[PDB]
Amino acid sequence: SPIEEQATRLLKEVPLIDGHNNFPYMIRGWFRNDINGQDAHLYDMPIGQTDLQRLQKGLLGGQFWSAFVPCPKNPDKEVGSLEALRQTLQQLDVIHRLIERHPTILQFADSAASIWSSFRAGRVASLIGIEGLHQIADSVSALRMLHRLGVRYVTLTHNCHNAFADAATVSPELHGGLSRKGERLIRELNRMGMMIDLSHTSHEAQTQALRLSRAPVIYSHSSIYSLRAHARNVTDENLHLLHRNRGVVMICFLRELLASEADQATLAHVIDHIIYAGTRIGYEHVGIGSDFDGMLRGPDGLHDVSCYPALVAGLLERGVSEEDVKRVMGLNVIRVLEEVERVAAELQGAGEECLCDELDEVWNEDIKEQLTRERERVRKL
Amino acid sequence: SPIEEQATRLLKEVPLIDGHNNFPYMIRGWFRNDINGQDAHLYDMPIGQTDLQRLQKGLLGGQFWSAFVPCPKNPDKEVGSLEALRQTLQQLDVIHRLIERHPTILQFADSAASIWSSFRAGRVASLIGIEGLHQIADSVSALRMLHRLGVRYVTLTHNCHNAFADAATVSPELHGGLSRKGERLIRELNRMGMMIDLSHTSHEAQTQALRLSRAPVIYSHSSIYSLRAHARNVTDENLHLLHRNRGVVMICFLRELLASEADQATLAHVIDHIIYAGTRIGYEHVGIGSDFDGMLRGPDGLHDVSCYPALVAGLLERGVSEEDVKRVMGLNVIRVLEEVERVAAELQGAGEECLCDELDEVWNEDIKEQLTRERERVRKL
Numbered sequence A, B: 001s002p003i004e005e006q007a008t009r010l011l012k013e014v015p016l017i018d019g020h021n022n023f024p025y026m027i028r029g030w031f032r033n034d035i036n037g038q039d040a041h042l043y044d045m046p047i048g049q050t051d052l053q054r055l056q057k058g059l060l061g062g063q064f065w066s067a068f069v070p071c072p073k074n075p076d077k078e079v080g081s082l083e084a085l086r087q088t089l090q091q092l093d094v095i096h097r098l099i100e101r102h103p104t105i106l107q108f109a110d111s112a113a114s115i116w117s118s119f120r121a122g123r124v125a126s127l128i129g130i131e132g133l134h135q136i137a138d139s140v141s142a143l144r145m146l147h148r149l150g151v152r153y154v155t156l157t158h159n160c161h162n163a164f165a166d167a168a169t170v171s172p173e174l175h176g177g178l179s180r181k182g183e184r185l186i187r188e189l190n191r192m193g194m195m196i197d198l199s200h201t202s203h204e205a206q207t208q209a210l211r212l213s214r215a216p217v218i219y220s221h222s223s224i225y226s227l228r229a230h231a232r233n234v235t236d237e238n239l240h241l242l243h244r245n246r247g248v249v250m251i252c253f254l255r256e257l258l259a260s261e262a263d264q265a266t267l268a269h270v271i272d273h274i275i276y277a278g279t280r281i282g283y284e285h286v287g288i289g290s291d292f293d294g295m296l297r298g299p300d301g302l303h304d305v306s307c308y309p310a311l312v313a314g315l316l317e318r319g320v321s322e323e324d325v326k327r328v329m330g331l332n333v334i335r336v337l338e339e340v341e342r343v344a345a346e347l348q349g350a351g352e353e354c355l356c357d358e359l360d361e362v363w364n365e366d367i368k369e370q371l372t373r374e375r376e377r378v379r380k381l
Ligand SMILES: [Fe+3]
Pocket: A131, A200, A221, A291, A294
């Protein structure tokens, strides 16, 4: 078909960068992060919507791999929060080992420039996002260390309230959007160059974050509220604020977010959501955020990671221009990451103060006095 | 003096690389890791043996900065171990921020090559070590992530027994040296390219580790048992095993480890310990491991980081050749790090299996069956 050859051409010219894939959690579920001697299975998986052969087949340009861990279920909330931090390092570890062990397929990327170099070398640009601020165990220091480990976006919540923001699916509301610590954290996220992800967060938390952020944000995997009313879908008001923020809504393939009857969800529904957003806030603010492996079964025509060429062709068939399809595929999310870097470099260049954790005093006043007396002793030498 | 001009010349030719400095913990003690607007104090500290002005003054070439956190004192050992992991990320964060904020003085290094580039650029090569396997919260995944954060040595214990090895100062013995998990961890430390540090570990743990390691190890801050009997000092048997291991004993300035009466400890005593080791196992297996800021008061003539030229001159004055002084200063620890890299590259090139954490099952058998049935459904499409 001429439209399919057009789709293949676009997939070679620019990278389709998917916003959110849960394959690392499937590796934890199926292999318990032990991939030694499992190459055959990683290329042809016995479960799930992602493997290395189908990843090649669908011509995907890049991927934000999710380092998700569940919300803590421990009654002792101190243990559970700290446990989630340890589990986050487990998931970041298996993501890096997966990339390290398959360099012909995957190449780690943490920037707009590294996405392009990976794509030009014929690799799936492999980026990392965490899914919920419960994963940092109330530690901004840990957050900066996750950034150093390669994390480039943070979903502010998963399906639990945390100290910083309200999740969409949990009622009643804790903070009524963002907490005071959450508002302060947005400044630090902008300063460090961590992309803000508003998927899973409440409607009000989105509104507040979209007004406060000095850098463009994403919805890594959310769909459109006006086409399907759900707590996880983006309202017209928040789409309007996203436009002003310069951010990108990355349309999700979750059946429950695309249709009232999940079994009726299709490729066409995903395209309707992309076109709705593109028409109303411009095709420079819409992306693709599958959430493959966040579900058992995908929509008809989008069953797994091999199906991306059908989506690209489907957009072209509806009359979306090549230039706008290229934007939706990946240029938009690349721009957001680029602008996130630039805002961080500007704030770091100006010398903005970083947010610091509240620590206990380790020394009493007697120890401090001994130290000051000692310092004066060496001064008099 | 001609000997002092000789000392200055050597300090310009090759980097004096100190094995262990506790300045990051002083920053936690004094500033609680908030260094915003504290430049004046970081250059001229009101407490402690380390600041940025004296660091320049003593002509130090490089430094392994300790990311030490105390042994957990929580009665709930699950909370305490996980707490130590969070605190480790706090200390790694402040070390990186300290380096980031003072690039004219400090430059991060994680390799023999990056040490040299830093030194040629006129910076203190700034490396990182953690002090005790209690800091990883029983997670080998966390350990690999600490390596990715820039940690290049791990002291196997501090002053507490952990799951992997016995500390020197604590009795009775838990494992009688290394545990079975500890023996297995040594293989993983060698595979990943993490330098083993045997300071603080029991005599028997050293013996076992020195036989098992496939890469050379260090004592980042230990002195000689035969000159001063202490649990923290290296016996002639372990010095012999260190020679066979190809490792380096980095002589410490702790007064209690240099003399029976702490107030009688001196520069001369440090030189005696260096010469003892150098004479018996060769000057290619001896280094300098101050443990500045692990103590209130240093030896006479080694009160702070400005005093390194006196040590270099003192070694030359005793008849240690320029070539051997250069080795003791830093070429030896550079070689060990170089050999640690090479062993890791060789084992990773051969495709050795990495050690994986023991994880719980997240899916029951019903979920796995649903996933396999779903995979077969998309196969039949
Ligand atoms: Fe999600």
